[PDB]
Amino acid sequence: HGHSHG
Amino acid sequence: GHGHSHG
Amino acid sequence: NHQWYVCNREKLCESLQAVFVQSYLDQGTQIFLNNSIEKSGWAAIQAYHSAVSSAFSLAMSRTSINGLLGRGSMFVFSPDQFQRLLKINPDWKTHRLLDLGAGDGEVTKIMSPHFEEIYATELSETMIWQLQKKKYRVLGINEWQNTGFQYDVISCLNLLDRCDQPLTLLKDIRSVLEPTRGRVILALVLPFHPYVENVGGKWEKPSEILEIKGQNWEEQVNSLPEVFRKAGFVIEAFTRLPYLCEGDMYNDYYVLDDAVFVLKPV
Amino acid sequence: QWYVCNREKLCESLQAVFVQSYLDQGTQIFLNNSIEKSGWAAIQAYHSAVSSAFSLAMSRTSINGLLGRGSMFVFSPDQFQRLLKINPDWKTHRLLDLGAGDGEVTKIMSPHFEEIYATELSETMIWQLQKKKYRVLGINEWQNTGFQYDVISCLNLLDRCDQPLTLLKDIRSVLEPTRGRVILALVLPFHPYVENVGGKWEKPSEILEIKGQNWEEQVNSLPEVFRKAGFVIEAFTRLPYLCEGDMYNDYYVLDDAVFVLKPV
Ligand SMILES: Nc1ncnc2c1ncn2[C@@H]1O[C@H](CSCC[C@H](N)C(=O)O)[C@@H](O)[C@H]1O
Ligand SMILES: Nc1ncnc2c1ncn2[C@@H]1O[C@H](CSCC[C@H](N)C(=O)O)[C@@H](O)[C@H]1O
């Protein structure tokens, strides 16, 4: 779902 | 109930 | 049916009486109405649209919600109505088109067959996605005047009452319009009640106000040649068209009173 | 771990402006809040469901602000008051936060300004910024407001915009020249791209000459880069670019190098 910076 | 897309 | 298209021609400016085109509820308009009535019976999706909009109304603009779902496609004219207003034949074609504030491009698709390159602008992030899906070229709001090119046709379809700088947009159109043969397609919802859409059902008054003084549909159109003359435009042809949109769980289609104008630079 | 570096590897002039940070209270509060948020499995499922369905029609950033999820952390209030070297009650007139995200990073700097200004490409981040009472300006409107900004924050934006070097000279022009300061975060190793809709991306239209084979070298390449736009590093530190986590991981970390730039 990832880090919110790419 | 649901707007006219323009408004 | 009829009240969407007729105007009191005696209440019109006698210069507009000459250039008034009478449009009718044609086959292309009923292709839209039947589909909107169809998509209103899709209660499975009509509750899905109603679910997403109720969820994200505070976090996005109503237009951006309609863009994300691809719902609420609107209608102005049919290709026949469009050809009859521009005084062009079906197979007519030219180079450049620019649709200012194109939305989900469902009205641009009506005009798109007549052009080799289609440019368009939008403020909504989801609407720009719906435009790039149609392979249109999305330009910034202050780039289309400064790329250098002139568009053979520039369409401002009901963007005047929804943008912050309407008269500036009129000026910007006159500068980058192909002067020899370029036409301008303008739509405008009357009664003219402008605002600038913000996020969460809020709004803000436009920085500029247009001199649209009129009381009936014909009277508001009477004062428009002055406004277009201020931007270097005269009215070549105009008509009354129903500004439609796809309905919902409670209604099959939503109608507004559009005054559409074909302009040429003076 | 996140806060240390080989002080020998730095340039001799950077050795004199570095500031040491530590895993302090505020960072723990964020970390402990994030671990709590991830513990709520119902939210994560709802978040990981909405983002999945609309990922094609919006950006990863816009979906986060749409949900108010994925908030990030750079510096704590004390960490910010030690890099800028200001007292807990310090206050000036205007702040400008470029690419402010959802504003949970701007909200740390907010107690020091009467006016906060922010720019954002994402339409839902603008809504999140206005939800914090910030005057959201256009990406080409802030340089022409007719007034200067006492602190212009550009946090983790150079590696995310199309014309970063243009943005630097832009900040230099509108920064209050006498006492204004620029705070600038940057993810190292410097890997820039412009975010697009549908998980896509594009290479920036301006290349920054930030090179290195580790954190200490990429930092050493930045003084000359700031010298181009008319800046000199007054202070800088190493910090974690912390971000709220998903069901898989309680939080996410990226290596940030924050700089306080006085105009030269
Ligand atoms: N300043 C601006 N520049 C470009 N697009 C704008 C704009 N201001 C508003 N818009 C967009 O223009 C749209 C106006 S509604 C009109 C949409 C379309 N032209 C039609 O006739 O159906 C909105 O969706 C809004 O997102
Ligand atoms: N050209 C541009 N102008 C303004 N903001 C931009 C931009 N390009 C990218 N951004 C923004 O920069 C952000 C990078 S993520 C950084 C978020 C925030 N500054 C923080 O440090 O926590 C994204 O949210 C994106 O919306």
Numbering used by the authors:
A (entry chain C): -3 to 2
B (entry chain D): -4 to 2
C (entry chain B): 53 to 318
D (entry chain A): 55 to 318
Sentences copied from the publication:
Unlike SETD3 or METTL18, which methylates a unique substrate, METTL9 specifically recognizes an xHxH motif (H is for histidine and x denotes small residues.) and catalyzes the methylation of the second histidine. xHxH, as a known metal binding motif, is found in a wide range of metal binding proteins, suggesting the potential role of METTL9-dependent histidine methylation in mediating the metal binding capacities for those proteins. Based on the predicted METTL9 structure from AlphaFold11, we chose to mutate its surface-exposed hydrophobic residues to stabilize the protein. One METTL9 fragment (METTL946–318) with six mutations, named METTL9M6 afterwards, exhibited high solubility and homogeneity. In all METTL9M6 complexes, H1 and H-2 are snugly positioned into histidine-specific pockets, while x-1 forms hydrogen bond or hydrophobic interactions with METTL9M6 and x-3 stacks with the aromatic ring of METTL9M6 Tyr306.
Given that crystallization trials on the wild type failed, we used METTL9M6 for structural studies and obtained the crystal structures of a METTL9 variant in complex with SAH and different peptide substrates, including mouse S100A9101–111 and human SLC39A5369–380, at resolutions of 3.43 Å and 1.69 Å, respectively. The structure of METTL9M6–mS100A9 is largely similar to that of METTL9M6–SLC39A5, with residues 103–108 of the mS100A9 peptide well resolved and the substrate histidine His107 positioned in the catalytic pocket. METTL9M6 recognizes the xHxH motif in mS100A9 (104GHSH107) in the same manner as shown in the METTL9M6–SLC39A5 complex. Superposition of the two substrate-bound METTL9M6 structures indicates that the two GHSH motifs align very well, suggesting the conserved xHxH recognition mode by METTL9M6.
